[PDB]
Amino acid sequence: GGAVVTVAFTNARDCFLHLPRRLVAQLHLLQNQAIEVASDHQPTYLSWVEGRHFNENVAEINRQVGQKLGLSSGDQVFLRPCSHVVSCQQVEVEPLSADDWEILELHAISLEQHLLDQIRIVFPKAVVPIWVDQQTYIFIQIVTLMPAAPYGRLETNTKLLIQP
Question: Where is this gene product found?
Answer without folding.
Answer: Cytoplasm, Cytosol; Peroxisome membrane
